[PDB]
Design a protein around this ligand. Structure first.
Ligand SMILES: CCOC(=O)[C@@H](C)c1cccc(C(=O)c2ccccc2)c1
Ligand SMILES: CCOC(=O)[C@@H](C)c1cccc(C(=O)c2ccccc2)c1
Lengths: 387, 387
């Protein structure tokens, strides 16, 4: 039966999500799709055609893919030290949980940024030795700050381990977007437009709403913590509209980031996901050669018995490649999948996957910040059970 | 029986040493003393009255004692970073045996210099990752270069471990002499004269010969390796005059060092050794307080299974304090001693000890570079056996 509809309708009928859309493609054509709920519970307006979602860290596979294209074109290489493009990242320091600070003993490379092994942290990282200083600097909160300037502020702060020696999910994709700009002399949003969005016909994807976009933007629900102080336990899961402060502008022509900030649609993101099965547009144009796509997807960071964790949340059986998660042990997995399934997700509960063993892609779009309910994994599992 | 004479005479009669003097004091007055052999085997001139010896690293306890006086007087402290006095030692790097170089993760302190834990090495260190670059720079060989200038060259080279983390006998006492000059605005030789030599009436001790000193200087025998390349096995122990090149001038008024370079006499060095029993001159003037002398003599570096070693030669049962060796386990010792016996020695086979349990001091003066025979320890053992 249609387990995907069941999952989505149950979430809407339990007042856990306002509105959900999903699509599963196989061999580049839709095989399951649906929608549940509404654009916003306040007016119960129906989900519009080509509804728009804040995809947060589903920005990261796109920016990472751009970096792989630029590696293929010779702009830089995985081993390139980022200080060669921005000397503000020369002479980094490292801080630990015992207040000890010392010089970094390795240079940060492009590969370190793509694997979150550079030693950067994130503003909302609970218990982190440096996240308090990120929050004081408002690195994430101040979305009106130009990327180039935010990077100058970040560069003055210490790392939390020596580059290459550990893994911690981080602001490093934003550093990557910035280093792309340094290396090319172009803006990351223009490069994304020319190299990825326009060839794949992702006309609704970008760091600002399209002209007719305000009426299609889905409402975002959830509770962002006071002052950005990382919470010690989950807030109650309640459909209250979320206040984004100045972190996620809708119409700032200079807003651009590497780790979040894109708006997109279900249809646009599926075009990107389907492309990742081959590296080609549907017309057959190559965005990334098979050899470099294989380089990008191969498991690259392997985890100990604790596994891959973000703020202590597990990604069971997943390793990390240059674009995001990749399933490397079905026997350790916590929900239905196949070896080699890859993809990523965002904090407003958007989720996608690519499953090469089934020539399958899937994406769930919704807007709930810090959900206590893993809707993305639930929908993936339903789709796996159906195919 | 006079074991000391028997040892010394056997060494002279076996053509191993040209000339030997010794004196052992108890309670500040001589109990055993003697001489054997000649000033030089070429003319067989007898050892002159107030014969002069190149004491090499028996310079180090003198310069270290000076540093303790300056600590007592508030000039600097054990924890003082040396870069505060000479910024050429900011931003040190560390090299390892696998060609890897990285920034030092700790600042070098005065204490590190006094304990040879700063990470410096020495030109003649066999197998050392950096000693080839010391030799290329001629740090030891170029005795005509001003101390201040040698330090500038040394400061550009990497350490061989992070400061504080290991022990390696080193050029750090020369760094200490230079930092003393930076901290005080005075020259180390003027400070030694005023603070130590003049109070102890050590009128023949200094970095150049007295005006009547040339005829009193003992000839120096042995083989220095060609180009300074550290030898893979001992050279034959043969009494041939040694060529010191420009490493050890006799009449350069600006030659001064921390780790070697002093000329002295048996009588002068015994005045210094006897003072180390109390921190006082024989007239009762305090050069160093009892509390700071105890701080200087307390065992400070402890060694693992292989023990304290220099170029793989062992100092069995010895630990390191701020002035040199200190006996911390008679059950591990390789020759007669008592708990707390301390002192040092030099590469031309001069040797001294202070034994607080016996209120005893002893010194052996001779001139043979890189002796295969441990004459100093043999004479200490003889004297211990005669009490
Ligand atoms: C998936 C992408 O989200 C991120 O990981 C970073 C980029 C991010 C960026 C901007 C805003 C937020 C939050 O609003 C938030 C974070 C943690 C808990 C509750 C809310 C998070
Ligand atoms: C005790 C003080 O030894 C030193 O610190 C330096 C000043 C030194 C200076 C000049 C010559 C030598 C050697 O002749 C030698 C070194 C190693 C092996 C064999 C011979 C050593």
């Amino acid at each position: 039966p249609d387990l995907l509809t069941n999952v989505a309708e149950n979430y809407v009928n339990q007042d856990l999500f306002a509105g959900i859309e999903w699509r599963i493609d196989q061999d580049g054509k839709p095989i399951f799709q649906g929608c549940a709920g509404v654009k916003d519970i306040e007016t119960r307006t129906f989900i519009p055609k080509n509804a728009i979602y804040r995809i947060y860290s589903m920005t990261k596979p796109i920016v990472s893919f751009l970096a792989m294209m630029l590696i293929e074109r010779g702009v830089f290489r995985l081993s390139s030290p980022i200080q060669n493009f921005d000397p503000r990242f020369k002479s980094m320091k490292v801080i630990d949980q015992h207040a000890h600070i010392e010089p970094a003993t390795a240079l940060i490379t492009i590969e370190h940024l793509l694997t979150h092994q550079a030693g950067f942290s994130y503003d909302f990282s609970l218990g982190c030795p440096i996240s308090a200083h990120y929050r004081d600097a408002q690195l994430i909160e101040d979305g009106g700050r130009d990327l180039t300037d935010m990077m100058g502020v970040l560069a003055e702060l210490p790392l939390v381990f020596h580059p290459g020696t550990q893994w911690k999910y981080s602001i490093s994709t934003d550093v990557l977007a910035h280093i792309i700009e340094c290396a090319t002399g172009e803006r990351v949003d223009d490069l994304l437009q020319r190299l990825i969005f326009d060839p794949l016909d992702m006309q609704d994807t970008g760091f600002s709403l399209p002209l007719d976009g305000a009426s299609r933007l889905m409402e975002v629900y959830g509770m962002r913590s006071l002052h950005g102080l990382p919470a010690l336990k989950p807030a109650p899961h309640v459909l209250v509209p979320a206040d984004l402060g100045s972190s996620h502008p809708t119409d700032d022509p200079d807003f651009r980031r590497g780790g979040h900030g894109l708006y997109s649609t279900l249809d646009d993101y599926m075009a990107f996901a389907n492309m990742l099965l081959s590296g080609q547009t549907p017309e057959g144009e190559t965005l990334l050669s098979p050899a470099v796509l294989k380089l990008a997807l191969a498991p690259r960071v392997h985890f100990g018995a604790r596994g891959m964790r973000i703020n202590d949340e597990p990604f069971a059986g997943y390793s990390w490649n240059l674009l995001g998660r990749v399933m490397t042990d079905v026997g350790a997995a916590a929900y239905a999948t196949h070896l080699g399934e890859f993809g990523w997700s965002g904090v407003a509960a958007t989720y996608f996957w690519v499953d090469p063993t089934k020539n399958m892609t899937g994406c769930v779009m919704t807007q709930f910040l810090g959900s206590q309910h893993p809707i993305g994994s639930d929908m993936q599992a339903a789709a796996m059970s159906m195919l």
